[PDB]
From a paper:
In Escherichia coli and many other bacterial species, the glycolytic enzyme enolase is a component of the multi-enzyme RNA degradosome, an assembly that is involved in RNA processing and degradation. Enolase (EC 4.2.1.11) is a glycolytic enzyme that is universally conserved in organisms from all domains of life.
In the present study, enolase was cocrystallized with a longer region of RNase E that contains 28 residues and encompasses the conserved region of RNase E (residues 823–850). The cysteine at position 832 was substituted by alanine to avoid oxidation of the synthetic microdomain. The complex with the 28-residue RNase E microdomain belongs to space group P212121, with unit-cell parameters a = 103.9, b = 110.2, c = 160.3 Å, compared with P21 for the 15-mer microdomain with pseudo-orthorhombic unit-cell parameters a = 77.1, b = 124.2, c = 96.1 Å, β = 90.6°. The crystal structure reveals two independent complexes in the asymmetric unit and the microdomains overlay well for the two complexes. As found in the structure with the shorter version of the recognition site, a single RNase E microdomain is bound in a canyon in the protomer–protomer groove of the dimeric enolase. As only a single RNase E microdomain is bound to the dimeric enolase, the interaction is asymmetric. In comparison to the earlier structure with the shorter RNase E microdomain, the conserved extension shown here continues to span up and out of the inter-protomer groove. The RNase E residue Cys832 was substituted by alanine and the Cβ atom of this amino acid is nestled into a hydrophobic enclosure. The binding of the RNase E microdomain has little effect on the structure of the enolase dimer. The proximity of the AR2 motif to the free N-terminal end of the enolase-binding microdomain suggests that the AR2 segment could be in a position to make additional contacts with the surface of enolase.
Residue numbers in the entry:
A (entry chain B), C (entry chain A): 1 to 430
B (entry chain E): 1 to 28
Write the structure that this text describes.
């Protein structure tokens, strides 16, 4: 199914910043279209998106250069090529970019084209993208509906309150389908607004569609959620479990961990993990992301020891979707899970490779959104088509989040029990 | 015949939502 | 182009509440998919969406009954019919429902199908929806890119602040293309965040993706907007004009308009009109929505005599997209513009009639979003395909808003010079 035309354009993301969209058109008229979510334009360990830095446009966040890469050199190198050969398409772009971190064309240029191509190929085969991804994965007809961790309360750098933990999430583990899991998420989300209103707190939303109210402490955060869950008529632990993202690099000071929100007690790697431990016995927190700084490997080894058999330990900043760090982390015994952000690597073939590496080590792969998203719902098809088992795609508001939940509903409607919702058991240590 | 038949809209939300369009005449 | 299958489903809107999605499939594999935004389930003047009122699901906001109507009686009636005959399809559904306000099946069921059908037919004709809409409108090949009024500051019932005005919006009238207009909106949006953060104010967003910071007066809202426009390198008046939605009924009592953001000053309707006049003399406010209570027709007649030749006076609550009310308003010299909310009427055919009524009278039609939106971008194609000339679809954040902006970029790319961005002259009085 030969590529005949590829159209790159600058559109706007969920935060109002430019990103790259690509359309890939094939002989026969098949078309696929995808957009890159927001990434990093600087950084040493991840694929870099290309920003223009022209201060007279979008405050320097233009993507006209990445768009020109798509329309010119990338397109020209792909015209006449077989869209079905995803590995081959991805390879052409990676080789032509010629850098290790995709910094010449931008991870934004290459990823948009990678995903649009996969979509066009699925169309040429008369199948949904999730079906085509399973085929690309060498696992045809193997699916699941992912268990979502839904943002609900934000702290740390993601708010202006006295909560130290960056986000608390809910997971509707007791649902029997993803449709039911979405409904439970929605109900708790609305009951949470009522609870915050009743305390005269703010219910405006952040980038990921959750609340960032003026909570006095971490414990106040956990308490309002527990209250919302009960108000919604569910039981914490059985129906709904808790996940968190510490973003522990944020309070890492000269080898120690300082949590202002709590007496400023400045913990050692060791004491911070027992502190987390204490939360996990007090609340059904079953997943902790970036529970220590990403350089603090000897500390992570300790956390993985203490909590690893009981609790999901997710690397985001820790791994940044980088198989070299992941490989190294598996052998050392660091964490048990990994956040998968396809823009941190930059192609669908490399993404499939990262997921497979995790899986092969018994690590869980959590398919993740970014802070800056679009209406694009590719990660829904990705989570299902790789049977990853878990998704992190936002709260139950903002269409940049809820488009993904909607696509999951559509997919489950088509697949039924061919894509089981496995609930609690997807979560590492559960 | 549609150049690009969908069994269900989920097979291409972009084309089903009218955010992208088939280009005619169809290159064959 | 024969309809062979219609599918309805319960999906989630931008506020986390259910809404109806419909897929219409035609002989040959053409498919159109659309969703209804959120609307009123009660009231006596507009079309009514159907809600389930089952407290055990979505806090009573399920739409399983509306979805059942789509899958059952609607699908069975429309199977075998020609989707190209838009008026025919809409008539079948309206007759079958049999109520004057679509309350048997729901305006949400009927609209989702009406729109899905129009998309399917467009695809059967090998054209985008905006092009099909122009043909349905009797104005083939006549397009414009609409001038957006973009939410920026929220007050009244949409905030917890001392601003009486429900919303302030910017209009990038100095832009040469809608693509430019969208970039100008984005830049001002981000600079506003900077301004508000420097003031220690909250930059979390409301339903429409704009800010609702704790401003102390109506004057302070205008001042921070002015500072943001300036900070972005633009001139108020020349590059960017202001529109407002007073929602004046929210502060109407005992026949007086009472403004807390004016230190609780009371105004008669003639006096409020003169208050508005002075505002338009000090700030480049060129559009004013619902500037009096909906019941205040004597007041609106006066307001239209005083301001109407130089200011766009937009009926929202005033007309609720009801051609019966609009016809009377035209007869009585009430306002000079109308907000078009297609889910308040409930079918594409009737929507086209409402826009046409407005235009025939020299009133402007402003295509509007709803507070509860989806990733659907139908209103973009609607504004272009009717050459409505203006759109109200949110701030420059949340993909429930930004998906419409992205669609205008796509359409403008496709049409170029065939779809002029006419700038300020689209606005009534300019
Ligand atoms: Mg209004």
């Amino acid at each position: 199914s030969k590529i005949v035309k590829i159209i790159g354009r600058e559109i706007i993301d969920s935060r109002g910043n430019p990103t790259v969209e690509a359309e890939v058109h094939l002989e026969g008229g098949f078309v696929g279209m995808a957009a890159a979510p927001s990434g990093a334009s600087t950084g040493s360990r991840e694929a870099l998106e290309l920003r223009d830095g022209d201060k007279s446009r979008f405050l320097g966040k233009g993507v006209t250069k990445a768009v020109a890469a798509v329309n010119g050199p990338i397109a020209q190198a792909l015209i006449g090529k077989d869209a079905k050969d995803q590995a081959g398409i991805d390879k052409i772009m990676i080789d032509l970019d010629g850098t290790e971190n995709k910094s010449k064309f931008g991870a934004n240029a290459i990823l948009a084209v990678s995903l649009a191509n996969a979509k066009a190929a699925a169309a040429a085969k008369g199948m949904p993208l999730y079906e085509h991804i399973a085929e690309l994965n060498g696992t045809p007809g193997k699916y699941s509906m992912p268990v979502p961790m839904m943002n609900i309360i934000n702290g740390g750098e993601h708010a202006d309150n006295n909560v130290d933990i960056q986000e608390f999430m809910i997971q509707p583990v007791g649902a029997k389908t993803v449709k039911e899991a979405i409904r439970m998420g929605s109900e708790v989300f609305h009951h949470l607004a009522k609870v915050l209103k009743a305390k005269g707190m703010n219910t405006a939303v952040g980038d990921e569609g959750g609340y960032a109210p003026n909570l006095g402490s971490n414990a106040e955060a956990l308490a309002v959620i527990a209250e919302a869950v009960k108000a919604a008529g569910y039981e914490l632990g059985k129906d709904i479990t808790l996940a968190m993202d510490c973003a522990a690099s944020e309070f890492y000071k000269d080898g120690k961990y300082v949590l202002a929100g709590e007496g400023n007690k400045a913990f050692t790697s060791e004491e911070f993990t027992h502190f987390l431990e204490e939360l996990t016995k007090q609340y059904p927190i079953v997943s902790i992301e970036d529970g220590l700084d990403e350089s603090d490997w000897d500390g992570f080894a300790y956390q993985t020891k203490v909590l690893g058999d009981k609790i999901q330990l997710v690397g985001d900043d820790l791994f940044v979707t980088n198989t070299k760090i992941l490989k190294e982390g598996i052998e050392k015994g660091i964490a048990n899970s990994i956040l998968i952000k396809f823009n941190q690597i930059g192609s669908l073939t490399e993404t499939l490779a990262a997921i497979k590496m995790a899986k092969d080590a018994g690590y869980t792969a959590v398919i993740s959104h970014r802070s800056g998203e679009t209406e694009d719902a590719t990660i829904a098809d990705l989570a299902v088509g790789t049977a990853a088992g878990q998704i992190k795609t936002g709260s139950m508001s903002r269409s940049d989040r809820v488009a993904k939940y909607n696509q999951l509903i559509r997919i489950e409607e088509a697949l039924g029990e061919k894509a089981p919702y496995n609930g609690r058991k997807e979560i590492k240590g559960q | 015949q549609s150049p690009m038949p969908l069994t269900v809209a989920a097979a291409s939300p972009e084309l089903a939502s009218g955010k992208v369009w088939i280009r005619y005449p169809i290159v064959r």
